[PDB]
Amino acid sequence: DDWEIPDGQITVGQRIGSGSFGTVYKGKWHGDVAVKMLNVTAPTPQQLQAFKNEVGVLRKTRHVNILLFMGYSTKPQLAIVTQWCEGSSLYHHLHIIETKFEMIKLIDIARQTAQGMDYLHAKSIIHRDLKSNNIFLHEDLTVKIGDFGLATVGSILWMAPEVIRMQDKNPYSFQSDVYAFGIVLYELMTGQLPYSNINNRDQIIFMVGRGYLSPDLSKVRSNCPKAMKRLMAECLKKKRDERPLFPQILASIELLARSLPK
Numbered sequence: 001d002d003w004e005i006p007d008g009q010i011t012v013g014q015r016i017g018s019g020s021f022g023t024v025y026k027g028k029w030h031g032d033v034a035v036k037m038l039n040v041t042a043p044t045p046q047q048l049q050a051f052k053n054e055v056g057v058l059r060k061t062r063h064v065n066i067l068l069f070m071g072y073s074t075k076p077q078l079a080i081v082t083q084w085c086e087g088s089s090l091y092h093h094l095h096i097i098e099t100k101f102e103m104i105k106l107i108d109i110a111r112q113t114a115q116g117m118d119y120l121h122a123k124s125i126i127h128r129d130l131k132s133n134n135i136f137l138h139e140d141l142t143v144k145i146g147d148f149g150l151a152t153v154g155s156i157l158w159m160a161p162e163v164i165r166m167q168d169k170n171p172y173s174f175q176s177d178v179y180a181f182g183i184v185l186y187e188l189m190t191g192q193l194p195y196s197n198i199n200n201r202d203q204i205i206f207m208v209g210r211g212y213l214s215p216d217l218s219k220v221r222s223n224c225p226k227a228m229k230r231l232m233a234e235c236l237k238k239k240r241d242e243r244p245l246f247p248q249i250l251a252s253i254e255l256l257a258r259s260l261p262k
């Protein structure tokens, strides 16, 4: 059972980026893989706890829409190993290379993302950092959600007001995840990052926090169905308790997706 990987088995290739506490590379281990390494010398005791948490959470997950955890290693450097997703993150498609998807496809990405979140929530995992950067579109047709510095039982911008204005012990909850999901529905349906006409991050954080600013839902593609626009507003509720949980979101998308081809 134990998912540890003996030194030297794993080969490290292209540096590709960063993620919650570490650098990400393309590697090879029984095929090619994603490797998240924390590559210092002595590991922090705090990062030691952070590393052991993502691993703990990942080895709890087995689902198409969740980035497949494959293994970990400690020697030489602490490293998580997951499947390689060819293609790119949803963020990358939408805001960098500008892949223009179609509504049927965009709705599908929405459903699959909703799918993995229900699973996550069913097994009592809270992501606390859902955003299009963390949604990889593998072979350009399957969504894998994947970054897990988070809880069981700054990218702004996807943060609910409650999270923004850290007033109380635990702001993070199922509803905050639901909120983040809402911003992703926004990016899919508008093709934009929200608040693109404010050029000041502080002002963005201050106002979302006080409930002065909210995503401008009038910006959505005209062929985006009514029910989808309707669903987004519900997800983006300023009041935590006023948001629907993921089962309900999933039934919503499934319904509108079914009566869409026309």
Ligand SMILES: Oc1cc(Nc2c(-c3ncccn3)oc3cnccc23)ccc1Cl
Binding pocket: 016, 017, 018, 019, 024, 034, 035, 036, 080, 081, 082, 083, 084, 085, 086, 089, 136, 146, 147, 148
């Ligand atoms: O938490 C994690 C995040 C990533 N991020 C992955 C990235 C990536 N791309 C750009 C910047 C950062 N990461 O590309 C990938 C391709 N296939 C799989 C995973 C990734 C990888 C592993 C872990 Cl364990």
